[PDB]
Amino acid sequence: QDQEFQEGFDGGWCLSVHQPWASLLVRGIKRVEGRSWYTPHRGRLWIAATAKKPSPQEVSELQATYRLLRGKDVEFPNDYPSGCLLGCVDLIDCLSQKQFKEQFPDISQESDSPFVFICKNPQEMVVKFPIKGNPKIWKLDSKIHQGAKKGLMKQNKAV
Structure with missing residues (x-):
């Protein structure tokens, strides 16, 4: 097998x-x-x-x-655009509350949901593509995905 791969x-x-x-x-x-x-x-x-x-x-x-x-000095974006592809994260794990509380006790207060998607490596595109969404985790159009992979990302400052 090769799960990580x-x-x-x-x-x-x-x-x-x-x-x-x-x-x-x-x-x-x-x-x-x-x-x-x-x-x-x-x-x-x-x-x-x-x-x-x-x-x-x-x-x-x-x-x-x-x-x-997160901290009193955290900075936020000036705009929260609607209806567009913004960027990406890496979904590391999908944890139950029980797992989230024991693996991440200092930050478990950040989600009260039955399942908690642990997100790392956030990336934000400079150019955001208008897009219609769908439920759950869904497949991007191949041309949109190709553009997103080529797209310039911002180097965002750490939180």
Whole structure:
């Protein structure tokens, strides 16, 4: 077998996430994503922002929460664009609450969900591609994926 080997390939898979959480994921400010379902997916996972347009107050209050969770001096993006492919993370593991609490006791407070997607290596594209989303973890159009792999990434500052 070769589990680590197969997961190292980028299969062009995507998760749709509402703003403001979507941009927080590709910036590394949000480092776990909770869901009520279990995924066997491991490795590269592209992040698309849905069509939702959060209000300025919603963004402001979520920023205040992530400052409390991550540190008072954490910096945030000026824009949380809707309806586009933002970048990617690497999905390291999909943990139950029990596993998340014992493996990550200092940060388990960051997700209360039945399953917790452990995200590493956040990358944000400079050019973001308009895209329609789908449920769960879904397959990017091949041409979109090809463009995303070629696309210039920002060197974001560490959180």
